[PDB]
């Protein structure tokens, strides 16, 4: 756990900003958070950010693949990476006696890669298989289809790239993404730790001794205003008869930007609908027998997407759609809005409480917060903002985002 804290941030003379937040315990999560992701791509390089992420982790001169494998096996340096639409990270969760090796590996891999045609060409099959695998989880497929028909802009791209895009990715494209997106001024080193701030700082200093300062600062290729998103509600239906007597469906609305005063209202409304679990279903849902329900709301630059999705038997599909639309409408009723606000606020608080017990979760929020917000948002200010959120804020959110708005919708049917 973590004690309503605040990060401490120092900048090395080479430009690398080191952000730490104090945590009790013996686990440390640390690594690099970079504003690199599919939002910053176009049609010509779709999939490159994720493709780079893999190449990075295929090792460099100092730490080739065999040396990496050896470090996980014998030395307990278990490296993790992921790429989203908006950010990328390379991290390790470690015992504290492993600090210098971990800061050294991560710095070398992220900031000193050696990107070769052979490693790039050799990686292609791994990414093709990953794309195949994700394509067999219909929650992932319908999530991507919903993004695709809602955004003609780059948010509509799958993170991995289409099959065709994965095949066309060149070494030059991978090197270009690293050269334009992985500089000191587009990233933070993050550590969630008991170790003092200065210990992390010196260790990163030592790990990044090869790194020369930037001569200049061209406008970051990751700036949101270079990738203005346009949400346009559309409907598309697909077949997948391998599903049998089953269909997937997803409903989408535009959501507020992260810095919108209406962001927290959208999170509360999304949460009060929430997900269906084995024992748990929103009081807004009338037919509690619906097979399943998942709700998400993400910000994407000037835009964002609120999504509701599930699967049902063919005969229950249309009823699922009505239940969800009815539940969303029910929040706006003056008899229900107060209670919806209260329950939704509690949902957001419970989600927060659950995040505070893991150094991995804390690291990811801190890294994302630093990259994506104008100014750092503490859990402190966040809770006050949640507590000060009122019925008029919810109404204004409904007025701007929900009421009288066309929704996107995708259906993938076993029969249709």
């Amino acid at each position: 756990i973590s004690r309503y804290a605040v990060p401490q941030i120092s900048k090395l003379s080479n430009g690398v900003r080191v952000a730490t937040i104090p945590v009790i315990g013996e686990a440390t999560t640390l690594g690099y958070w970079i504003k690199s992701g599919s939002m910053y791509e176009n049609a010509s390089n779709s999939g490159v950010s994720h493709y780079l992420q893999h190449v990075i982790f295929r090792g460099n001169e100092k730490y080739p693949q065999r040396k990496l494998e050896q470090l996980a096996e014998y030395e307990g340096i278990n490296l993790m990476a992921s790429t989203s639409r908006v950010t990328t990270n390379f991290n390790a969760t470690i015992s504290n006696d492993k600090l210098d090796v971990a800061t050294d590996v991560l710095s070398q891999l992220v900031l000193n890669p050696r990107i070769k045609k052979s490693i790039v060409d050799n990686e292609r099959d791994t990414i093709l298989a990953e794309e195949y695998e994700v394509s067999q989880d219909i929650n992932e497929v319908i999530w991507d289809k919903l993004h695709e028909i809602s955004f003609k802009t780059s948010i509509g791209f799958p993170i991995l790239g289409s099959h065709q895009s994965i095949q066309k990715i060149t070494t030059e494209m991978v090197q270009s993404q690293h050269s334009n997106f992985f500089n000191q001024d587009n990233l933070y080193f993050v550590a969630v730790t008991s170790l003092p701030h200065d210990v992390i700082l010196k260790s990163v200093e030592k790990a990044t001794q090869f790194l020369k300062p930037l001569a200049s600062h061209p406008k970051l290729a990751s700036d949101n205003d270079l990738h203005v998103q346009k949400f346009e509600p559309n409907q598309k239906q697909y077949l997948l008869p391998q599903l049998g007597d089953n269909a997937f469906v997803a409903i989408g609305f535009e959501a507020p930007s992260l810095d919108s005063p209406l962001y927290i209202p959208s999170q509360i409304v999304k949460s009060v609908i929430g997900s269906k679990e084995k024992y748990s279903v929103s009081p807004l849902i009338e037919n509690t027998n619906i097979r399943t329900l998942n709700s998400y709301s993400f910000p994407y630059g000037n835009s964002g997407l609120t999504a509701f999705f599930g699967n049902e038997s063919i005969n229950n599909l249309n009823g699922w759609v009505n239940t969800i639309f009815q539940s969303i409408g029910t929040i706006f009723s003056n008899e229900n809005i107060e209670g919806s606000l209260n329950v939704g606020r509690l949902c957001v608080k419970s989600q927060l409480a659950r995040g505070l017990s893991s150094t991995r979760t804390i690291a990811d929020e801190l890294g994302n917060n630093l990259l994506l917000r104008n100014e750092y948002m503490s859990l402190g200010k966040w809770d006050e903002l949640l507590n000060a959120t009122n019925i008029n804020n919810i109404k204004e959110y409904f007025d701007k985002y929900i009421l009288e708005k066309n929704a996107s919708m995708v259906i993938i049917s076993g029969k249709q």
Binding site: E73, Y74, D137, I138, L243, S280, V343, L346, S357
Partner: protein
Amino acid sequence: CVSSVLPNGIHLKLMKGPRGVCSIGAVFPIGSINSPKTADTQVTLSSKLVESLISPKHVFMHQVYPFLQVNREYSYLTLQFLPESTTYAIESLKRFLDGAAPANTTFDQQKQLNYAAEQLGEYNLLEKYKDLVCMSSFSNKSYAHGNYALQGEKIDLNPQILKEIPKCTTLVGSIDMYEELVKLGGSLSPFPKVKLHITSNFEPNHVNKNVKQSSLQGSKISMTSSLSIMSLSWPSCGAKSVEAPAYAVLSKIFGGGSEFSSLLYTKVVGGVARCHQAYAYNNFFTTGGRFNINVVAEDRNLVKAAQLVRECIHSVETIEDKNLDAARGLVITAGDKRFNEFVRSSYLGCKPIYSSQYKKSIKEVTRKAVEKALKQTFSYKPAVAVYGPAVPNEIAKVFE
């Protein structure tokens, strides 16, 4: 762990650590073997749980996270929540322990969910290995009772176990729930039942669960619904044995992995075309253990996989020091899931997987201890269980 005994005899075990999420629950020695068939226990306890929580809406509105684990010989219920939901959570645990049968309508709803388990993502590869092991490696045939009914078979409420639960319950909780659990425990009848339950002896049976799999499982079009599963079991040791950490190390030496680096991975996953995955587990029961190696592959290829598993066994005897240390390293995984492990380890009477004491145990396992474990386990003929049509005796021949 802070361990107490209430004035009425009820045991109370508390997990130390920082505040944030409150945890409560109950663990008791009633499992799928205490009903006359597969799923009877599971659906009885599930029916009871949903009634105890009043409605799914109450659960959501209080943001309570319930979790029910039914095993062959024992089960537990945990509830996680923020401090403002304490009253509802405790009152729900109290109702669960009140002995009353659920309504037939609740039971009917729960039965339908149970039949749908595989389609719903609730009957995954892990649960299949457990059923295959339990239906094949015990002399007592009651261990064949799992949690997930076959499509053509009946499921019946077992009201007697609901009466039995409060008579053999241990209460569990995070340390901040001490006062509320003392009080809840106090409300239960003195004094607990004491039953000698003993894990059934090993027997190397050869069985099939030749049953079709649904194409959609959860949200995935399963990459395994057309493949067979081979589970090979040998007896090992109780969770309390001095030998258990050697067994954990022995399971990492075999290890495994998916097509989507250790003996099972390199030799079995690498050696059979279209072998989706292979893994070794060491699974614990009240007084014993089953060391099990599970292979997912096409039906025609299982015999070959078994030959490659035999090779893995032979290979362990000459394992290098590098690898014996790496195996020791792999067991050390520190990382909600913490409380569930606390409860599990409290029943087994072993040190939790996250504890430093456990980590120290693992650091202290020798080559001798691993060799001893290997010798006594692989001296038995394996139990053999196939999810699919493959003839288990043909697989069994590979080891005789």
